[PDB]
Amino acid sequence: GLRQAERNTEDGMSLIQTTEGFLQESNDIIQRIRTLAIQSSNGIYTEEDRQMIQVEVSQLIDEVDRIASQAEFNKMNLLQGDFARGSRATSMWFHIGPNMHQRERVFIATMTARSLNLKGQSGELLSLSTADKSNDAIGTLDAALTRISKQRANLGAYFNRLEHAAKGLMNAYENTQASESRIRDADMAEETVAFTKNQILVQSGTAMLAQANVRPQGVLSLL
Amino acid sequence: LMNAYENTQASESRIRDADMAEETVAFTKNQILVQSGTAMLAQANVRPQGVLSLL
């Protein structure tokens, strides 16, 4: 059971690594969008400049959407939040114990542009086409960055507790194997001397039988 | 994608790859086991010749 649990923990932490890898470039692109928007705050750029920068801005958000829709670890999507707080479709479980009841839950939130507030229900992305709306976009990206920080902190705690559990499982594995050796294993160092004692006694007894079997011929001399 | 590739091989490494120490120890244990078992069987084969001493 512990041998099962250790590899289950390993695959879970691999999943966690996949999630944080998917999170890193999203954080990078959000920071890039923030820098571009802050540059757009300058008043020396006319409206067509803001529109043409918004072209690649919209490209960046749709690329983030592509990342979210294409996230995959074990042929299962993760960034769409199938296992959020209010997840109704299904639930994650990490069987990290030798018994069926030892089951641990791990949750992941929705990482879509709607959840990142980059777009509304209609799907239209952040306008940013004017300096007045440029300041408004700052709060949205700050909220997105805070949400990403919360997600990375959650995954950090996840993998830290997971690796501590895996180390504990490995130690319990080795100690339990040592106990099994103490109980069931027969260190042949005593069995060899018992062997030799018995395998000397056997031929001593056979020799005694051999000398005993010659006794009856004595009466024949009386005849 | 390249970061995902790196993480994906990192994940794969713990399914099929081998960490040589924890099976070379098992192989050494099995080798000493087979040597001991062969020796014990060989010395066990000579048991019944003692019966012919009665004959």
Contact A74, A68 (CB under 8 A): no
- Enumerate the residues of chain B whose CB falls inside 8 A of the CB of residue A14: 10-11, 14
B36 and A188 Cβ atoms separated by less than 8 Å: yes
Q: Tell me which residues of chain A, numbers 12 to 41, contact chain B at a CB-CB cutoff of 8 Å.
A: 14-15, 17-18, 21-22, 24-25
Distance CA A139, CA A144 (A): 9
Q: How far is B28 from chain A (nearest CA, A)?
A: 16
Q: What is the CA radius of gyration of chain A?
A: 37
Outline where DSSP puts E strands in A49-170: 80-83, 108-110
Q: Do B11 and A7 touch (CB under 8 A)?
A: no
Specify whether the CB–CB gap between A99 and A1 falls below 8 A.
yes
Residue of B nearest to A10 (CA): B14
Resolution in A: 4.3
Torsion of CA A168, A172, A173, A176, to 10 degrees: 180
Instruction: Give the span between the Cα atoms of B28 and B40, in whole angstroms.
Output: 18
